[PDB]
Amino acid sequence: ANQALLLSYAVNIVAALAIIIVGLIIARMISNAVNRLMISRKIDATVADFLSALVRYGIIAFTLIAALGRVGVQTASVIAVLGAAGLAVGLALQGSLSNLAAGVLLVMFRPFRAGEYVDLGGVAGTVLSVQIFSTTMRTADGKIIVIPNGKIIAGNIINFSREPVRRNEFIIGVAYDSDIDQVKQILTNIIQSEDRILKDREMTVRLNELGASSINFVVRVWSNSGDLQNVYWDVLERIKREFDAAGISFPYPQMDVNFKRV
Amino acid sequence: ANQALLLSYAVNIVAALAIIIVGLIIARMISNAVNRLMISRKIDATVADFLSALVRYGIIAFTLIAALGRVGVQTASVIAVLGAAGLAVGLALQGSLSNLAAGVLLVMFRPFRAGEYVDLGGVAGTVLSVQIFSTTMRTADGKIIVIPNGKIIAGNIINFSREPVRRNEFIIGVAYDSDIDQVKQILTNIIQSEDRILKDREMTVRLNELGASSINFVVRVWSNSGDLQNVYWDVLERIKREFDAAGISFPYPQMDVNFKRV
Amino acid sequence: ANQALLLSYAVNIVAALAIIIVGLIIARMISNAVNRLMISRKIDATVADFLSALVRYGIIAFTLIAALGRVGVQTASVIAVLGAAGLAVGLALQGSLSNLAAGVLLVMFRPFRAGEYVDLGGVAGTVLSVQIFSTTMRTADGKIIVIPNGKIIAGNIINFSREPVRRNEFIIGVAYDSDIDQVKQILTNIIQSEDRILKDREMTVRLNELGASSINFVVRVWSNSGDLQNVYWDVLERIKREFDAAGISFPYPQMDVNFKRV
Amino acid sequence: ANQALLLSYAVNIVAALAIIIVGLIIARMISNAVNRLMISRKIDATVADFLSALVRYGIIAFTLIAALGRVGVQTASVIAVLGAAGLAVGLALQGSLSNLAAGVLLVMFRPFRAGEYVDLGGVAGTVLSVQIFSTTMRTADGKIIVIPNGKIIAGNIINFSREPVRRNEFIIGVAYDSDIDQVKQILTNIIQSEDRILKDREMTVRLNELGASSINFVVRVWSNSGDLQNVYWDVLERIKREFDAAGISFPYPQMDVNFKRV
Amino acid sequence: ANQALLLSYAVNIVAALAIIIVGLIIARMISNAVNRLMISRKIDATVADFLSALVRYGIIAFTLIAALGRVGVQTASVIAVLGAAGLAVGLALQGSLSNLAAGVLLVMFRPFRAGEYVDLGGVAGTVLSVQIFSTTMRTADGKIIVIPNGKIIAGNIINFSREPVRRNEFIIGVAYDSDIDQVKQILTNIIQSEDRILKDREMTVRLNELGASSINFVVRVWSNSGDLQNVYWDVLERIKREFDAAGISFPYPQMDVNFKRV
Amino acid sequence: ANQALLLSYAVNIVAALAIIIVGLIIARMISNAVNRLMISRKIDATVADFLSALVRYGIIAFTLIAALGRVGVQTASVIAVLGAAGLAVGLALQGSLSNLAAGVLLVMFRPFRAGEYVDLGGVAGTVLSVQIFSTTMRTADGKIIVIPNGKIIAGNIINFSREPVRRNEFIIGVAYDSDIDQVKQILTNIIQSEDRILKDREMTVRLNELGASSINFVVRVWSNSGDLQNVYWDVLERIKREFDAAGISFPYPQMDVNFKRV
Amino acid sequence: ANQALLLSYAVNIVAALAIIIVGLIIARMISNAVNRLMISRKIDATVADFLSALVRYGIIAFTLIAALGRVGVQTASVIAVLGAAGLAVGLALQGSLSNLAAGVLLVMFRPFRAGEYVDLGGVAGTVLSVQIFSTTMRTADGKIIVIPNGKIIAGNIINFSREPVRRNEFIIGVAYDSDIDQVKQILTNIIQSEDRILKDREMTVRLNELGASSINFVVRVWSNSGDLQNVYWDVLERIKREFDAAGISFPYPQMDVNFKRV
């Protein structure tokens, strides 16, 4: 029969809903304004969206604390419950947040760009795109790999395609009776007739190891990154043909045998 | 004999039960409304159920704090005890929550879809379905594997079936005395007569290594993902037959032996 | 001589004991009621016992805070001491709680059931039972293994017995001079006369590799999970007998030897 | 000269010491009563001692907070300092507490008992006793191993001695020219004359693999855990003697050699 | 000109210094008294020093909070700053505290004592002393190893010197044509003439494996820990001499060779 | 109609905006002043920027707490929400902060400088630059590697280029019948005629191992870091030529063969 | 126009700056006094600098809380912001603090000193100096290694140079037909004529293993740490010369061959 307290309670509830509505409006407005202010200062779009989302959820948290205080919930209760909900959402989004930060770093510092062959922790292939949470790459034989950004940032990032020039390394092994000067002279002529091998870099042709069955010569020559494999195959076929023409042997595995007829 | 205090205590208990009932009702209603509001905005059904469950448990926590305050328990006591119960439930559900978030990410970004052959951390097989906590896959020989979603998201996701085309790589090894031009010409004719090998891609036929007993030619040819294995087996049998017809040898392992009758 | 303060102190102590007794009674009653309410809603019995134990310990914590406030201990002291005791009990029960949650998940989602051969992280054997903290399994030779549930849930769960059908894979290796058509025809007749090999699945008989001493044919045939091993042994003995009858050889390891009498 | 404040200070100090003494007495009494109440309910003695120690230290903490409040230290100061001392003691006792809980679990669920051969994470030997913090075991050759209980509970617990029966697995390898029916018949007679091999279990004698130099027969037979090794050695010597009597050969490693006098 | 407030400030500062001095005195006295009280109850000296240091730093913390309150710093400020300093000191001393607790456990339970050969996680050598933070051991060839106590407690502790008796295991391999009864009889006589081999234990002499080139007999005999190596060397030389006298052969690695003059 | 409360609310909002503006101004000024004060004291530029950023964000946090208190938000709400936003930003920047600190340490202590060959955790190459978050290095063959600074600081940092002098180690293996004095004399003359080998260091020429087919001499000689590889190749070719001239043999792998015509 | 409030605000600001200045002065003075008091008590210089830095930053924190309270910032705000700045600085300095504590432990307990050969976790070389954050060592061939102190303290610390004496272990392998008494007598005379081998230690010369092609004698002899390698090389050359003079053979790898002309 006494509606006056009921009127006060309904009025407090309507005031709580009005505070919620106005708080969502002001949160969206201040967050969009901070986002435009950051984009105008050339902050990265993902960092801008992240900081704007944090500002919007903070203003919404103040609005919730105010409205729930209007309905009689204490500030300590609302802070504890919003903290538990935030800890749950943070447990769900912890790894995704790590991948988001790693993706921002990969887009900012550019350890690798799309189209560059790389080697991210033992997998290797052409990069296709860095994305919000993971990087796609196509391996040499066409398989697609999707590496999460945090694993990429946490480890080494070998990059085959960054330097214009790269070095071949042949390991020719010839018979122990082969002349050393003739081998070095033939390998030197083979790498001096190769126009794609850079003459201003190193061009080693040195005996390198006395192996179990052969003396292993090493040849190290530099070439542009686009000519590396073709130079390898061409120098290899030329080595084979010229050694076969010159009489130098490539040994089969060797074994002395001390015969004992028991 | 003095029932007035007893009446006040029974009235406070009934008011606490009434606050509990009304609080559960309002919690269920606001949670269903937030869930419908999120589903209408095309949020994922699992993220919608998660955020709605958080809203419902938060409103129930406010209701518990209010009723337990009506029975005389202090707000600090109720917050501490609900925080301990929430920390226990969170210790129980930590890994399941990680798998739930990883499953939401796998369904959203689609690193792999059902029916695509993959390789999730060293296990490989056709995917069957991504589920709330774990992914099922059937390996090539019919074993079922159940990989938890967090392990899948944390590591690499090789995907054999995403790209339409993929590359074969034969490694033929022939005797050192074999002619190189004849080997390359026979392998080239074999891969040029193969209609399932894409002629617009690479078709390498290059000497690749001077091995212990053989010179290892490499052949790399591209084909549609569905023709890859049949092209491998057909080119392999054709290589065998044509080399046997042409007189080119596949060496047995070689060994020079220096006889010494001691 | 002034017993009035002594009377007030003894009365406060008796009131604290009465609050403790009534609080234990109400805790047991509300916990049993919540447990019956959950079991009636078809919640899992272990989750029901867990949530009921949490409700009972929470009501006991409120009762302790009330009684210890009656004896003059402050609410902050009781909350801090109960929090330290709860942190100690939680450090003791952390791993057991992880195993309990993993066991609930294994009983709910059924990645494997009792009597199904599995492979949980490198150990393999018939499952015997999933239990509250660990799973028992009997390996193929009769050893018992007890894997804690958390280790099982955290890793892959290969399941040999789930699919009705599974694939055999023979790897026959014959001499390089062997006819390929005759080998493929004999293997095809051997797998076509085998009634336990499913004719509606794949039945590959393809040359697969040119090995060091032999050409390795592959045979892949599907059969029901109960016939897999018997089909393997029967096809193997039939391959051996028919190749010996047809004159096809299984090579011994090969080695060319270039004799050099030095 | 004004001793009245000095009298009040000395009286407060004596009251603090009296509160400390009475609090230690009541703590010891309530802890012993809770310990007897738990032991009477058949709780494990270690869990009883743990919960009683927690009750005793909690009552001592309330007594310290009361006395230090009597000397003028605030409740927040005493709670913070006791919390720091408890965090230090907990950092010191964290691993010992994990081992204590794991030892309680090992004594309760009995994955292994004393005198049973086991394999706890790659070490194997007869168990000697489970103790409060670590398990002792004597390996087959007499070395003692002391494995902490937490490492045991965290990993697999293979148990060689639990099942009454266990399976032998011989892998006989005979020459390719050996008759298969004669080999299977001799192995079958050898395992049928062995009274310690259980005839109601499996008794496989199947050709299993066509190896590099031999066809590997497999023999799997079950026997009681106490007869396993003696049955292995006896069947092995009988296999050797009967194959030597029957003319079946055990091949030496084989190698074809294609002689080439260059 | 108004020195009265200056007098009050100087008096408060002198009172703060007096509280600091008296608090350090009372802290040292109560800590020494608790230390003597623990040593009198046969607590370990390191645990006694640890708990006494905690009591002394706690009383000093109360004294600091009181004096800094006298100079006007609030209790919350002093608690926060002392908590930050304690968290920094704890980050510095975390590992040293873990090693201290592990050293107390190693001195209490004695998994190993000084002079006993052990194997702590893959390093092995005579123990020299357990110390406050690390254990010293001298390996068999005289290198000193210093293993931190926490690494020792966390892993297995194999102990070669605890059991009085230990088992040798010879693995003799003889030619396939060797008589089995003669080999077993010679090995049995060799281990029956050895007085240092315990006749009340096992003395197996069983054929154990049919190897690639030899049948591997096993001999397992027990002896006192001090006679183990001398018994090994003596039985080994006796096996060699008696087999050479009896005509039994130790095979060289075997290889059939199928000659093919191509 | 009653605008007086509306005037008070608009005035409080304008005062909050004015406090925000003045607080940002004072934050930027005090942060720039602290930054100049640190740079003037020769603090590292990165540590200066870090501490100045912390001072600026702290002053901005005080300004936010003041303005949000002016609009009616409580201090506890603002502290909790700013703490949640700071915990989120810290979860995003945790790894980047670890790399920043590691980069400051690498620039301060200089374990390696640019242009020095190193080996950071199994990858090796010339360092190019240490940067804010990762170190770039060019391997010997031209690949670029980008190692995050925290991984570098956490592990070993081998440094090939720091010491002026470094040691070669040849391992010559000659036939068992070779004279030892003649081998040692020839190797000694070869390393005494080499002017780039430091005569004031060690120059060992000792028989080191009796191998399976050869006695392995060791030669260890020191040389300047720039002459190391050229000295290796020159001494190797001189060893080969002088041994071939002196008649000393480099054995092929050896094998006695006990012929048995069965 | 009303400057009185403006005068009060400017006066409060000047009082805050005066409190800041006086607080920095008193912080520096008390920190230097505590540092001198610790150095006078022979505390380590690094622990003294650490505790003095903690005292100085604590007094500065009290001064900041007082001044910021004078400008109107609440104590809770200042404590929260200083706690966030301290948590950020602690996240940056966590690893450096671990290395600092480990370096203090290495300088105090001296597991190794400069100039002693060691083996810290698989890297080995002469120690050069222990430093504030990392230890430098020069490997045997002149590479410099920089191991962070925490990695050193966390693992084993083998120390080759601590014990005055160390043991050589030769493993001579002679032909099966060689006399055992003659081999043992020659090895005994060789190690008895070696004056640098300690005659008061063990001098084993025992047959140790019957290998695939040779009986492996073991020789274990002790010598001073400075004579170890020279004794090894001298005993090795003497073994070689005396066995060649006595007619004892070092076998080449052996192989029986059962000829079969098929």
Ligand SMILES: CCCCCCCCCCCCO[C@@H]1O[C@H](CO)[C@@H](O[C@H]2O[C@H](CO)[C@@H](O)[C@H](O)[C@H]2O)[C@H](O)[C@H]1O
């Ligand atoms: C009340 C605040 C509500 C809003 C903020 C919510 C925060 C939620 C925090 C959840 C717990 C985060 O705890 C985090 O766990 C990882 C586990 O590898 C650890 O640190 C980790 O950081 C990233 C993830 O951010 C990982 O990819 C990385 O491998 C590791 O360094 C630390 O322990 C801590 O950074």
Ligand SMILES: CCCCCCCCCCCCO[C@@H]1O[C@H](CO)[C@@H](O[C@H]2O[C@H](CO)[C@@H](O)[C@H](O)[C@H]2O)[C@H](O)[C@H]1O
């Ligand atoms: C009072 C609030 C009540 C409601 C919220 C309850 C929260 C309960 C939190 C329990 C502890 C979580 O602590 C978590 O532990 C894991 C351990 O790998 C670490 O972080 C982990 O996150 C996920 C799980 O979320 C793991 O799959 C992942 O391997 C790892 O990065 C961090 O330390 C922290 O994220």
Ligand SMILES: CCCCCCCCCCCCO[C@@H]1O[C@H](CO)[C@@H](O[C@H]2O[C@H](CO)[C@@H](O)[C@H](O)[C@H]2O)[C@H](O)[C@H]1O
């Ligand atoms: C005041 C509240 C009293 C009642 C609640 C008591 C809670 C006690 C918590 C103790 C500390 C738990 O801290 C826990 O440690 C493990 C260590 O692997 C980490 O997380 C772990 O969770 C489970 C155990 O729950 C492990 O099996 C899992 O390997 C790991 O992910 C996180 O760091 C945190 O989940």
Ligand SMILES: CCCCCCCCCCCCO[C@@H]1O[C@H](CO)[C@@H](O[C@H]2O[C@H](CO)[C@@H](O)[C@H](O)[C@H]2O)[C@H](O)[C@H]1O
């Ligand atoms: C104020 C309260 C005073 C009384 C209570 C004192 C509690 C002291 C807690 C110290 C820190 C414990 O932090 C613990 O660290 C280990 C580190 O592996 C992790 O969890 C660990 O639990 C056990 C030990 O209990 C380990 O054997 C296990 O390998 C791991 O899962 C979690 O991080 C947390 O459980």
Ligand SMILES: CCCCCCCCCCCCO[C@@H]1O[C@H](CO)[C@@H](O[C@H]2O[C@H](CO)[C@@H](O)[C@H](O)[C@H]2O)[C@H](O)[C@H]1O
């Ligand atoms: C309210 C304050 C707001 C401002 C400050 C925000 C701080 C945010 C802290 C996030 C959690 C940090 O938790 C951190 O996790 C890593 C996980 O490897 C662990 O420690 C780590 O430190 C660094 C990163 O700093 C890692 O590179 C390192 O591998 C590891 O030692 C510790 O658990 C803790 O240092």
Ligand SMILES: CCCCCCCCCCCCO[C@@H]1O[C@H](CO)[C@@H](O[C@H]2O[C@H](CO)[C@@H](O)[C@H](O)[C@H]2O)[C@H](O)[C@H]1O
């Ligand atoms: C408000 C206080 C402000 C001043 C004090 C600031 C403290 C800052 C603490 C940052 C987090 C430290 O968290 C730390 O993380 C490491 C991560 O390996 C873990 O412990 C670690 O300690 C040291 C570093 O101290 C590591 O080298 C070690 O490998 C590991 O045991 C623990 O989780 C915790 O010791």
